């Protein structure tokens, strides 16, 4: 009914602003002192029975050789991962499909390294990992190929030691960013290929929030025609029954993106896109945000758009909005993020969305609703019947 429908549209607009306010990409910066790069990013692992495990990544890369390399301007990589099982495989294994693209530098105002030439076709890949987490040792072998033209990787991994003592998803980032698609205007910022064929050292520390950490060191280089990733991993301070050693993480996160859900995203999109030209500008994003209480600067609005602007044109195209909302529904929000969403409606911070607060939000968004059909909205969400929406009830409206 067009009352549940109003929860979706308004709810979707609030999680869109949540997405636009978060940092989900792989942020690369030059590190002149090491002749390399450094990176930071946040990974989300869905917890099988509900919630999310965050993994905070810090990364450094260093050329193995003394050839000249490209030190980039600030940019990011966007990564889409799909995990699956080979139904003919009896060993503990993971099948990985990964697409990696560089963006985050807008179009305007101007080279292409020799390493880049090694990546114009399909390149075979080998991966070898030796790990030790809280004294539990394991090895992993992987094979596949990479197609940098489309930023595409296909890789199958076997645990050669028997049972993997951590969940496979926690190893994805560790187990070849030289396969990233860099667009034509950003070819001078591709450190990864510029270091080849002699290769780079890749190091990370990965902090699992409320749990232990991984430390990784990898050598990434050509052995003949093959791109080889050789890794050592050490994990300490894990909890025996946390999400990692207790294996409480989801293996396959669904890309179920229905025609019904796309249509719901288009309804939220059209709240931002008030002139109906199919794109959202800083002006339009600024207008919806001020209407909900917030007061961002031109610069903040430019950054928020930059975070999802795949084509660098300075606006959120409808397809870029569909891409960001698919990510937002594929991976679970932290409690801190759902509470932020709740506080948009819960104006006074008392733990309860009153019908006055919900209308304030609605009529502030230019949504004409009679006291009757505002009450229908509260009805829809209000399980415990107090005529208010508490946190646990909000968390129910905001689910698939
Ligand atoms: Ca580090
Ligand atoms: Ca527009
Ligand atoms: Ca764009
Ligand atoms: Ca465009
Ligand atoms: Ca939310
Ligand atoms: Ca309130
Ligand atoms: Ca209630």
Numbering used by the authors: 38 to 147, 158 to 222, 226 to 450
What did the published study say regarding this structure?
Here we constructed the prototype of a photo-switchable Ca2+ sensor based on GCaMP5G that can be switched with 405/488-nm light and describe its molecular mechanisms at the structural level, including the importance of the interaction of the core barrel structure of the fluorescent protein with the Ca2+ receptor moiety. We engineered a prototype rsGEI based on the conventional Ca2+ indicator GCaMP5G28 by coupling cis/trans photo-isomerization, which underlies the photo-switching, to Ca2+ binding. In the present work we introduce the concept of rsGEIs. These sensors show photo-switching only when bound to the molecule of interest.
Several iterations led to variant rsGCaMP1.1, which shows a Ca2+ response similar to GCaMP5G but exhibits photochromism-based photo-switching in the Ca2+ bound form. The variant rsGCaMP1.1 shows a poor fluorescent quantum yield (QY) of only 1.6%. Towards gaining a better understanding of the molecular mechanism underlying the combination of Ca2+ susceptibility and photo-switching, we performed X-ray crystallography. We elucidated the structures of Ca2+-bound rsGCaMP1.1 at equilibrium and the 488-nm switched-off state to 2.15 and 2.90 Å, respectively. The crystal was switchable following 488- and 405-nm illumination, suggesting preservation of native switching characteristics. The chromophore shows a cis/trans isomerization between the ON and OFF state. In both states it lacks hydrogen bond interactions, except from the imidazolidone ring to R57 and E126 (all numbering GCaMP5G; 96 and 222, GFP numbering). This lack of stabilization may explain the exceptional speed of photo-switching and low photo-fatigue. The effect is most apparent with V54 of β-sheet 7 (V151 in rsEGFP2) that sterically blocks the position of the OBF-derived trans-chromophore of rsEGFP2 in rsGCaMP1.1.
